[PDB]
């Protein structure tokens, strides 16, 4: 259901990483499978060739934390007067809990989430780390 359209109509895009994360661009292919693309370091940009109706999303390359592109989750290249479409990649305002979960995951190996002195539901929250699949099985819902 969530898939790029095979328009074959070129569209030039600037992926602009205005976040402090290393960014993984993900293209949703014609069958809806996520295809990872080369990463963008913090504060960097890349001019890239995409197509009208193609679907992109953007992740933290290391953690798969969700990022925003032009204030929303999905980016679709559109018709270019000669000039490229700007894709502004930014941090969302994470909830405090999600942000805490991010920090705890970065300090604790997954084997040891269970050794933390916290309620079971918080172990489950740690273990249920960000994942493009769940987000696709949600955006497509």
């Amino acid at each position: 259901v969530l898939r790029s359209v095979n328009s074959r109509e070129p569209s030039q895009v600037i992926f602009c990483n205005r976040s402090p994360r290393v960014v993984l661009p993900v293209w949703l292919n014609f069958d809806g499978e996520p295809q990872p693309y080369p990463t963008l370091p913090p504060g960097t940009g890349r001019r890239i060739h995409s197509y009208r109706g193609h679907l992109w999303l953007f992740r933290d390359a290391g953690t798969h934390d969700g990022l925003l592109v032009n204030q929303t989750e999905l980016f679709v290249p559109s018709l270019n007067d000669g000039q490229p479409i700007f894709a502004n990649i930014t941090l969302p305002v994470y909830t405090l809990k999600e942000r805490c979960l991010q920090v705890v995951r970065s300090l604790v190996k997954p084997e040891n989430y269970r050794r933390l002195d916290i309620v079971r539901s918080l172990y489950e929250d740690l273990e249920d780390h960000p994942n493009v699949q769940k987000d696709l099985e949600r955006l497509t819902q």
């Binding site: 705890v104 300090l107 604790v108 190996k109 040891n112 050794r115 933390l116 002195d117």
Partner: protein, 104 residues
């Protein structure tokens, strides 16, 4: 430009914002509305340094670089008992526990 502050006295901390162009006296008015002590019974400080009423917050060192929402600048606050001002005095926040082994 908005600057984001913690006004702190003893065990009280007020989170508030103000304009960089606003004055120290204007900040005392903010404090008066909250804590019901007039400006003439207040001293405001940056670190150990007493601030002058007429100075802008920017001139006292509170800027967008130093007084951010997620990391606000601290303004010290002392009250006058009756005749004399109390010594500036901010109770520190509690100490975090040692990092669990699994985080270390």
């Amino acid at each position: 430009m908005d600057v984001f502050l913690m006004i702190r006295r003893h065990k009280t901390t007020i989170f508030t914002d103000a304009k960089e162009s606003s004055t120290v006296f204007e900040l005392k008015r903010i404090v008066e509305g909250i804590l019901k002590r007039p400006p003439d019974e207040q001293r405001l400080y940056k670190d150990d340094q007493l601030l002058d009423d007429g100075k802008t917050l920017g001139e006292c060192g509170f800027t967008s670089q130093t007084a951010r929402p997620q990391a606000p600048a601290t303004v010290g606050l002392a009250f006058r008992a009756d005749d004399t001002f109390e010594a500036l005095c901010i109770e520190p926040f509690s100490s975090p526990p040692e990092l669990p082994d699994v985080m270390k």
